[PDB]
Design a binder for this molecule. Sequence first.
Ligand SMILES: [Ca+2]
Ligand SMILES: [Ca+2]
Lengths: 357, 357
Amino acid sequence: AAPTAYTPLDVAQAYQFPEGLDGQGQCIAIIELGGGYDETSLAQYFASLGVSAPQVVSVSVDGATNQPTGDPNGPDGEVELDIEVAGALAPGAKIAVYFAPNTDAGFLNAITTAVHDPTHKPSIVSISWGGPEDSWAPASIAAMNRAFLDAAALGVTVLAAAGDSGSTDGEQDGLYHVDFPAASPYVLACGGTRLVASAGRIERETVWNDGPDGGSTGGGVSRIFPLPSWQERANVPPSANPGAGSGRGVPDVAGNADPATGYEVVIDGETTVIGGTSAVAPLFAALVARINQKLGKPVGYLNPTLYQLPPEVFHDITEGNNDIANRARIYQAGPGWDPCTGLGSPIGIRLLQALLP
Amino acid sequence: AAPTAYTPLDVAQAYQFPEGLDGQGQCIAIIELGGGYDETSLAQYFASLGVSAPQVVSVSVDGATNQPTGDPNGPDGEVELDIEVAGALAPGAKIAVYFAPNTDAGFLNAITTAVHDPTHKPSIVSISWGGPEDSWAPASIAAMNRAFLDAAALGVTVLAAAGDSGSTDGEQDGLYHVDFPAASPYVLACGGTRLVASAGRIERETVWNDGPDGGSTGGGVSRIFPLPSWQERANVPPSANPGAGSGRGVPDVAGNADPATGYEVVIDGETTVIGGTSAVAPLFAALVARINQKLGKPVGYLNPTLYQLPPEVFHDITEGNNDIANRARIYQAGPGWDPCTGLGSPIGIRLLQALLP
Ligand SMILES: [Ca+2]
Ligand SMILES: [Ca+2]
């Protein structure tokens, strides 16, 4: 019950990230709609972990720029968490941070700008911003989903945090909701767990659920995207919302997100702990950068492949639920894919081995 | 009964430290967060014991310096005890004393400065400062623990006193607590005993427990660090705190710490007796310096090896408990590893014999 924290290297070790690979030759794009980062925090942090610091550059979209507010509890926490987690684990990769206005067009423009960027040429895009899929204008959902389909066609992996307010995703309208962009079938949706691990083993990994006050992983069944062909054997349940419905199941994978077993980071000069699914997209972006480095070619769109890989590639989470609204336990983890943690946490070395011919 | 005192050489003889070795060629780093030493007490002391005085140098971390307050009952007692015990027993070693501000960053920076020091190049770091593991900010525990993981990877042994306020570690919150850094699985946690010995034999060795007013050795079960793989056969009991979880057992080894059978030292020119687990980390740091001298390479991280060594390498403490809060005898010593004294007191020559191929 005592709160703990890990450096990103400890979590990568627990998930058996492949050794001897650092993302050299890869560029990870990170999307930001507010805040900024300062070089002092990044340099202190990377030095503290003993890793050669990755090059980090900012890209302005629609007039937005890298502008830290200086408040460790503000958006700088998101920006610096993203860079510190991805950068500490794929320090050989180049990191390009795209800043855009916090509008639907700005979010879309940041994604399309990164995906098609001929200067930075990212092979991976990490996204830790989002909102309930049914709170978005339908036109915006369509445009962003098409941008993600385009990234898949181009061989660019797009990862997105699944949410921090459980199965209701922050809405109090008597229904369950999944977050977008995680709900897009073209995005690798990243859920969250409470991880108890040491260098040699995972002692326990359960659904992240700290109640209404502490947050919980997003997850559920989309009301907008049909169940994908490649997800039809995952046993995604019907939606818990009356009238139910078959839909794309969220998330696809999951990793440590509980702030109570969180990430030690340096935000605006302050050493602290941050969690949330915001950390999981950059964590797995670094894993993908390592895998791409070894393969010599980008894995791009991974979802169809992940769902047909052998079970041994994942650590199945089976205990917990992501309900923070009521006592119904919607949804619950269980054997195999579930709407709290998807396929579970990847075992890095096994995922790499499964992707090599 | 009657209070006694030993010179450090008498304790080393009781524990059969290997003869003919003095740590020549080694450097022992000693971390300090306050106080200071004066050459007069040190020169007087080493000369008085007939050992060639080791070179002792101070290193300033974050602007902190060697600043004795002159009060023999103040922090100078800690600084001078550490140097006098380690230096008297490994006089051939060079001693580097790192002074840092008494803050979480200062403690961390002293440790990383010493571990990575290209000028002093210590192979051993002795720490006699600490606090309840759950009283520390989780981010600081994570940073500190990773610094100790780094030291293990680099072949640097890190030893820490387990505490002087029994199984509750100075807290009055109805819970039992272990001290950090001793709780880190990467640190050799040093507990305390009451030793009745002469040059040729140990007549009695029991858990150090002089009640609330006299102090008692720290020890117990971590609420933060899982039970290490190498410690799973030690029979660490479930924690006495509610939930009765499994966790890293403290301490790993133990040595004389009872002030009533304490160490005769000279603090700020005053010849006196000082005990506590503060003395045990420097005592065993000197043992490790002698062993490193003989092996020709540093033993570095010792914990995994210690727990699989033959039982004859240790003197098993089986009598006593470290409870100074109530009558429950939590925790209690017994055959084999226990949460008061760990594997017991090392038998120097046997430990050295076991480490040579
Ligand atoms: Ca599952
Ligand atoms: Ca024992």
